[PDB]
Design an enzyme around this catalytic site. Structure first.
Site, PDB file in Angstrom:
ATOM      1  N   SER A  72      28.647  40.969  63.609  1.00  0.00           N
ATOM      2  CA  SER A  72      29.033  39.906  62.763  1.00  0.00           C
ATOM      3  C   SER A  72      30.247  40.377  62.027  1.00  0.00           C
ATOM      4  CB  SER A  72      28.249  38.885  62.232  1.00  0.00           C
ATOM      5  OG  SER A  72      27.550  38.251  62.974  1.00  0.00           O
ATOM      6  N   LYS A 119      33.871  39.659  62.472  1.00  0.00           N
ATOM      7  CA  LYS A 119      34.446  38.337  61.964  1.00  0.00           C
ATOM      8  C   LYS A 119      35.486  38.563  60.871  1.00  0.00           C
ATOM      9  CE  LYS A 119      30.501  35.259  63.196  1.00  0.00           C
ATOM     10  NZ  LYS A 119      29.494  36.110  63.529  1.00  0.00           N
ATOM     11  N   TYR A 153      26.678  28.655  58.913  1.00  0.00           N
ATOM     12  CA  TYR A 153      27.355  29.859  59.876  1.00  0.00           C
ATOM     13  C   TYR A 153      27.203  29.754  61.417  1.00  0.00           C
ATOM     14  CZ  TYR A 153      27.846  35.013  60.606  1.00  0.00           C
ATOM     15  OH  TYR A 153      28.339  36.221  60.779  1.00  0.00           O
ATOM     16  N   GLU A 191      33.242  37.211  52.869  1.00  0.00           N
ATOM     17  CA  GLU A 191      32.500  36.175  52.029  1.00  0.00           C
ATOM     18  C   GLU A 191      32.607  36.919  50.408  1.00  0.00           C
ATOM     19  OE1 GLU A 191      29.538  35.185  55.329  1.00  0.00           O
ATOM     20  OE2 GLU A 191      28.485  35.803  53.428  1.00  0.00           O
ATOM     21  N   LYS A 233      30.162  41.491  53.832  1.00  0.00           N
ATOM     22  CA  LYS A 233      29.938  41.124  55.200  1.00  0.00           C
ATOM     23  C   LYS A 233      28.772  41.975  56.012  1.00  0.00           C
ATOM     24  CE  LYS A 233      30.223  37.782  58.320  1.00  0.00           C
ATOM     25  NZ  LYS A 233      28.605  37.996  58.713  1.00  0.00           N
ATOM     26  N   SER A 284      25.169  42.328  62.684  1.00  0.00           N
ATOM     27  CA  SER A 284      24.038  42.891  63.458  1.00  0.00           C
ATOM     28  C   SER A 284      24.217  42.579  65.123  1.00  0.00           C
ATOM     29  CB  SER A 284      22.570  42.387  63.074  1.00  0.00           C
ATOM     30  OG  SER A 284      22.302  42.550  62.025  1.00  0.00           O
TER      31      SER A 284
END
Length: 359
Positions: free
Chosen positions: A63, A66, A149, A271, A314, A317
């Protein structure tokens, strides 16, 4: 001024007990301190072949991929090619369902479309089935009210964001983001010549690597080594150093604050939490129970430009890989942890906070 051999001590004392308690085969770690990247490698990359982890060892980011999608999207906005307030149907006109009316590009990028699922169904294998999936999707909530999410959400954002460029996602990502930052060992598709460096991920004693999936490149398919990742964090922590103008602004747009969800703020991929922050707050927020849960949002309009006093991070996995990235722009410190086994997010965040605490 933290001593070099003192930094090496801190890292080892946090990482070795982590790897023993969590049964982690190998791990590459990078700590950014006072404008300087410090690399530390531990364990095995390939247990059977007995290959050690090195600074050129490739890990699956899952992830964290992203953050790249968000910056690429940011660069596209900075060029004028796309606008966050644009309707999704502007870029994908075949999406005719009435439930798509009112949904913006911002919503796709920030998980606020209304309940798009965590994963794209494996039943989906082509354009026809992908279109069908979105046309039939029934939203649980109204747009701009709830954050959930989801790969099916930012995944589509990335696919659509590059359409005006005229280039395929992988090419757009390489020519506009990777090459400019000199990330020469960051891949969506690992070349033959580089396979010797690709580690094996481990799950239940079994060796695995990520499987092909729809929208995989946009949501979880990037592979890289600790060096390119260190330079990725430095580019995002100090964007003034970036030469290309659109890229520079793209990075600022990805760290802007579009929504507030309790104590955290949602950017594009990234984030953020205000700094200073207590460990317990960041750690418990990382637990699947909170991280994957649907929560209400508060709109930040106008979007707030990047705040230096922030904890930007962030988690990421895949079946056999577990990674984490975090940095504090105001203090110019950051950390990268790449491992070849997916262990609990809370344990990753706690280790990183402790280490950054000593700096």
């Amino acid at each position: 001024p933290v001593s070099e051999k003192q930094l090496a001590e801190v890292v080892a004392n946090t990482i070795t007990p982590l790897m023993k308690a969590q049964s982690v085969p190998g791990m590459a770690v990078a700590v950014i301190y006072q404008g300087k990247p410090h690399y530390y490698t531990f364990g095995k990359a390939d247990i059977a072949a007995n290959k050690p982890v090195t600074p050129q060892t490739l890990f699956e980011l899952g992830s964290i991929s992203k953050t790249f999608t968000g910056v690429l999207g940011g660069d596209a906005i900075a060029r004028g090619e796309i606008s966050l307030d644009d309707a999704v149907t502007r870029y994908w006109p075949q999406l005719t369902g009435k439930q798509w009316q009112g949904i913006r590009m911002l919503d796709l990028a920030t998980y606020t479309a209304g309940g798009l699922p965590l994963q794209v169904p494996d039943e989906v294998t082509d354009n026809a089935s992908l279109l069908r999936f979105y046309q039939n999707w029934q939203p649980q909530w109204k747009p701009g009210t709830t954050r959930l999410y989801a790969n099916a959400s930012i995944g589509l954002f990335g696919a659509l964001a590059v359409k005006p460029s005229g280039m395929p996602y992988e090419q757009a990502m390489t020519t506009r983001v990777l090459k400019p930052l000199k990330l020469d060992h960051t891949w969506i598709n690992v070349p033959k010549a580089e396979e010797a460096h690709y580690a094996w991920g481990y799950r239940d004693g079994k060796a695995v690597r990520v499987s092909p999936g729809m929208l995989d490149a946009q949501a979880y398919g990037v592979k890289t080594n600790v060096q390119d990742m260190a330079n990725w964090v430095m580019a995002n922590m100090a964007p003034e150093n970036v030469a290309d103008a659109s890229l520079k602004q793209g990075i600022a747009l990805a760290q802007s604050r579009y929504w507030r969800i309790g104590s955290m703020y949602q950017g594009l991929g990234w984030e953020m939490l205000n700094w200073p922050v207590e460990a317990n707050t960041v750690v418990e927020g990382s637990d699947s129970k909170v991280a994957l849960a649907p929560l209400p949002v508060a709109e930040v309009n106008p979007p707030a430009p990047p705040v230096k006093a922030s904890w930007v991070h962030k988690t990421g996995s895949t079946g056999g890989f577990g990674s984490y990235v975090a940095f504090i722009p105001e203090k110019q410190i950051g950390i990268v942890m790449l491992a070849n086994t997916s262990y609990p997010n809370p344990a990753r965040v706690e280790a990183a906070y402790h280490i950054l605490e000593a700096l």
